[PDB]
C-alpha cells in the first residue's frame, strides 16, 4: 500500500498544480474561478480520467491504436492527442529554463530580486517596506520582467535572442535527452527523496505564506466568489480546461500509462485517489500563493488583484518574494528552485518518453527497425529546442502565453474530451463499455460515470465552447496588452492543428475504404476484433 502510494507520488504533483493553477486562479478573480473548477472536476475530470485509463488498459497499446479497437472512424482522436503532446513538450520546458536561470542566479551572496540597485533596474523602483513609508515598481516584479525575461513592448518586437536563456534551455534539453536515452528514472532509494521533497518545500512555503501579516486578505480574495465573473466565458473555459491539463488527460499519455502498469489493481480506486490528491494539492498551494499575494498587497498598499502579474509569471514573482523573507534566503531559494526543476523534469521525461513511444509505434518499420531510435530521440529534442528558441527572445513571453492558452489548452482539450465521451457513450455504446469494464475490473462504472460520459461531459464541453463563441473576448497578456489579430490567428492555428485531426482522419478513412458510402461508414464504425 505504502509503495503504491509512493509510486503515485511521482505523478500526483507537478508544475500544473504549483505554477499553472495559481496564475489561472489569480487571472480570473480568485474565488470566482473555483466554482467552475469544482463543477468541471466532479462533472468530467475524474470520469474522463477513468475512461482514458480504462481505454489504455483495455487495448494495452498506444493512445492511437486503441481507437482502432474502439471506433476506427474516430481514430483521429489519438492523432490529436499526440499533436497536443508534441506542442506541449515545446513550451512546457521553457518553465524549466526559467527555473534553471533562477537557480543559477540564486548562487549569490544576496538574491538579485531582494533589492533594486542594479544596472537593469528602472529609476521608478521603490522598496516594498518603504513604498508605504506614484507609479513605483517592486524590485521582484521588474527583476522578473527585465532581467530574467527582458520583456519586449509587444509580440511584434521579438528583439534579441537571450543567450543565457538559450543555454538554460539547451542544458535542460540535454538532461532530458541523456535521461531518455539511458532510461534514467527514480526507482531506487532516490524515489523517496524525489517524491517527498516537493511536499516538504510546499509545506514550508505554505507555512511561511499564512504567517505573513497580510495573509488574511489574500485568503479572503482567494476564496470569496464574485458571481459577476461567472457571466464571462473565460472563467468557465479556463477552469474546465485546467482540470484536463492537470490530469494530463486528452493527451494520450494516460492511455499509454494504462498499458505499463501492474495487473490486478483496483483501477477505480486508483483513479479517484490520483484525481483527488492532484486537485487537492492545487487547492492547497493556492493558499500559499494567495497568502503571499495578500501580504504583498498589505505591504505595497495596492489591491490584491494588481500586486503581481496576471499570467505565467505569477509563480516567478510570488515564490521568490516568499523565499526572500526566510532565514538565510539563499538556502531556501536554492532548495525551492531545485525542487521546481526536479518536479518539472520528471513530468517532462514522462511526456517526452510517451511522445517517442507514440511516434515510433506509427512507423516501426523504419523508426524502430534498429538503433535509429536514439537518432529519432535526438531529432525530436533538437527540433523541440529550435521551436522553443522562439519563446526565449525578448518578446518570447507573448509567444509563451499564446502557446499556453491555445496549443495545449483551451478549446482543443474540450474538443478531445467531448469526442472521447461521445464516441464511447453513443457510438461504441455505454452498455458495451460497462460490459468491458465489468470483464476487466469486475464491477461496472456505476450511474455516476455512465451518466457523466453520456450527458454531463458532452453538455459541459459543448456549452463552454458555444458560450465562448457567443461571448468571445480576445486573449490578452497580463490584463493590459492586446494581442494583434495575426497573433490570435496563430494561436487559433495552434489549436486547430489538434482540433482538425478528427475530421481529417474521418474523411481520409472514408475515402480510403471500398464500397458504398453507407457500407464504408458501417465498416469503419464497427470495432475491430
Amino acid at each position: 500500500k505504502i509503495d503504491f502510494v509512493l509510486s503515485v507520488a511521482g505523478g500526483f504533483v507537478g508544475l500544473g498544480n504549483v505554477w499553472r493553477f495559481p496564475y489561472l486562479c489569480y487571472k480570473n478573480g480568485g474565488g470566482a474561478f473555483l466554482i467552475p473548477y469544482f463543477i468541471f472536476l466532479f462533472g468530467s475530470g475524474l470520469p474522463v480520467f477513468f475512461l482514458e485509463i480504462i481505454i489504455g488498459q483495455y487495448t494495452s497499446e498506444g493512445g492511437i491504436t486503441c481507437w482502432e479497437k474502439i471506433c476506427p472512424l474516430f481514430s483521429g482522436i489519438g492523432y490529436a492527442s499526440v499533436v497536443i503532446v508534441s506542442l506541449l513538450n515545446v513550451y512546457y520546458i521553457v518553465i524549466l529554463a526559467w527555473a534553471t536561470y533562477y537557480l543559477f542566479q540564486s548562487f549569490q551572496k544576496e538574491l538579485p530580486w531582494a533589492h533594486c540597485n542594479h544596472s537593469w533596474n528602472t529609476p521608478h523602483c521603490m522598496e516594498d517596506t518603504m513604498r508605504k513609508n506614484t507609479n513605483f515598481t517592486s524590485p521582484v516584479i521588474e527583476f522578473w520582467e527585465r532581467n530574467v525575461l527582458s520583456l519586449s513592448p509587444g509580440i511584434d518586437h521579438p528583439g534579441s535572442l537571450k543567450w543565457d536563456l538559450a543555454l538554460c534551455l539547451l542544458l535542460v534539453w540535454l538532461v532530458c535527452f541523456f535521461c531518455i536515452w539511458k532510461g534514467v528514472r527514480s526507482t531506487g532509494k532516490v524515489v523517496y527523496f524525489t517524491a517527498t521533497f516537493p511536499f516538504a518545500m510546499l509545506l514550508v512555503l505554505l507555512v511561511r505564506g499564512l504567517t505573513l501579516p497580510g495573509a488574511g486578505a489574500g485568503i479572503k480574495f482567494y476564496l470569496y466568489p464574485d458571481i459577476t465573473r461567472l457571466e464571462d466565458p473565460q472563467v468557465w473555459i479556463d477552469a474546465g480546461t485546467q482540470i484536463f491539463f492537470s490530469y494530463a488527460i486528452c493527451l494520450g499519455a494516460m492511455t499509454s500509462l494504462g498499458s505499463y502498469n501492474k495487473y490486478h489493481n483496483n483501477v477505480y480506486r486508483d483513479c479517484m485517489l490520483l484525481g483527488c490528491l492532484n486537485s487537492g494539492t492545487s487547492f492547497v498551494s493556492g493558499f500559499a500563493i494567495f497568502s503571499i499575494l495578500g501580504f504583498m498587497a498589505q505591504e505595497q498598499g495596492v489591491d490584491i488583484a494588481d500586486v503581481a502579474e496576471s499570467g505565467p509569471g505569477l509563480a516567478f514573482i510570488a515564490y521568490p518574494k516568499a523565499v526572500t523573507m526566510m532565514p538565510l534566503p539563499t538556502f531556501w531559494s536554492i532548495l525551492f528552485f531545485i525542487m521546481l526543476l526536479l518536479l518539472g523534469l520528471d513530468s517532462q521525461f514522462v511526456e517526452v518518453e510517451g511522445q517517442i513511444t507514440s511516434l515510433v509505434d506509427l512507423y516501426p518499420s523504419f523508426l524502430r527497425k534498429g538503433y535509429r531510435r536514439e537518432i529519432f530521440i535526438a531529432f525530436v529534442c533538437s527540433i523541440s529546442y529550435l521551436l522553443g528558441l522562439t519563446m526565449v527572445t525578448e518578446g518570447g513571453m507573448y509567444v509563451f502565453q499564446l502557446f499556453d492558452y491555445y496549443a495545449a489548452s483551451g478549446v482543443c482539450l474540450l474538443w478531445v474530451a467531448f469526442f472521447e465521451c461521445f464516441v464511447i457513450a453513443w457510438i461504441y455504446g455505454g452498455n458495451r463499455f460497462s460490459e468491458d469494464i465489468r470483464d476487466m475490473i469486475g464491477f461496472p462504472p456505476g450511474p455516476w460515470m455512465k451518466y457523466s460520459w453520456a450527458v454531463i461531459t458532452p453538455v459541459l464541453c459543448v456549452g463552454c465552447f458555444i458560450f465562448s463563441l457567443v461571448k468571445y473576448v480576445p486573449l490578452t497578456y497580463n490584463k493590459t496588452y492586446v494581442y494583434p489579430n495575426w497573433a490570435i490567428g496563430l494561436g487559433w492555428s495552434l489549436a486547430l492543428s489538434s482540433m482538425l485531426c478528427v475530421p481529417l482522419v474521418i474523411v481520409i478513412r472514408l475515402c480510403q475504404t471500398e464500397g458504398p458510402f453507407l457500407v464504408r461508414v458501417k465498416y469503419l464504425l464497427t470495432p475491430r476484433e
Partner: antibody, heavy 118, light 107 residues
C-alpha cells in the same frame, strides 16, 4: 432481484443432450451477468459457466469447456444452458446465480432443477 | 484450477459456544474476491459474507470474517439453533471459479 427459477431438468441417458432454462424476474436481466453452479449429490458445489450481461464474454469450467454451451435471451429475460455430450458424472442439481459484481459474489440463487443421466 | 480446501468438514457444536472455520486456497486470492455462502438443508445456497468483511443483507451481525492472501476464516460469536448449515468459501479472482469443500454445522 426477487425471483430466479430454473426449469427443464429431467432424466437422460449417457451421451444424450438436454437444454436447461432459468427465468428471471424482478430486475433488469440485461444489466446483470449470470452464472450456473452445479451441486453434485455429494453436496459439493462446482461452477459450470458464466455469461456476461450482454453475452460478449463467455467463460466455462475445465470439465465442460468443450461440452456445455451457455446462452441468454435478454429480450425474454431467460437464461439457457445447453448440454451436448452429458457423461455419467454430470448428474447433479444446477442453480442459476447472478454474478454481475465479482467482488460481491452471487447475490441471489434460484430454486434449481435436478439432472440425472441414469 | 485454484483449489480451495476447508479443513473442518464435520463440526459438532452446542449452542452459545463460539465456532470458527477456516478456508485454505492453493493460490493467491484477493481480499475482495473471496466470499462465503450459507446453504440450509434442502435449500439453495445464499450469500453470507463478501469481500471477506462485508456482511450480506440477511445475515445478522453475529457473523464476521477475516483473512488475506492464502488463508481465510469466518467465525461465529455465539452459535444459535438457526446457524446449523453448510458454508462454502469461494474465490472470484480468476477462472475457473472454485468453491471450498464446505463445513456442515450439525448442531
Amino acid at each position: 432481484e426477487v425471483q430466479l427459477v430454473e426449469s427443464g431438468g429431467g432424466l437422460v441417458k449417457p451421451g444424450g443432450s438436454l437444454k436447461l432454462s432459468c427465468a428471471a424476474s424482478g430486475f433488469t436481466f440485461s444489466s446483470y451477468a449470470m452464472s450456473w453452479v452445479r451441486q453434485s449429490p455429494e453436496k459439493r458445489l462446482e461452477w459450470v459457466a458464466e455469461i456476461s450481461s450482454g453475452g460478449r464474454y463467455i467463460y466455462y469450467s475445465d470439465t465442460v469447456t468443450g461440452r456445455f454451451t451457455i446462452s441468454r435471451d435478454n429480450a425474454r429475460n431467460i437464461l439457457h444452458l445447453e448440454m451436448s455430450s452429458l457423461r455419467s458424472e454430470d448428474t447433479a442439481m444446477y442453480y442459476c446465480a447472478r454474478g454481475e459484481v465479482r467482488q460481491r459474489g452471487f447475490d441471489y440463487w434460484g430454486q434449481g432443477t435436478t439432472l440425472t443421466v441414469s | 484450477e485454484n483449489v480451495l480446501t476447508q479443513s473442518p468438514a464435520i463440526m459438532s457444536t452446542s449452542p452459545g459456544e463460539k465456532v470458527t472455520m477456516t478456508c485454505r486456497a492453493s493460490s493467491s486470492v484477493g481480499s475482495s474476491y473471496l466470499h462465503w455462502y450459507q446453504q440450509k438443508s434442502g435449500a439453495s445456497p445464499k450469500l453470507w459474507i463478501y469481500s471477506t468483511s462485508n456482511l450480506a443483507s440477511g445475515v445478522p451481525a453475529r457473523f464476521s470474517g477475516s483473512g488475506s492472501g492464502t488463508s481465510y476464516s469466518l467465525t461465529i460469536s455465539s452459535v444459535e439453533a438457526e446457524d446449523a448449515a453448510t458454508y462454502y468459501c469461494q474465490q472470484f479472482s480468476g477462472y475457473p471459479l472454485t468453491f471450498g469443500s464446505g463445513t456442515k454445522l450439525e448442531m
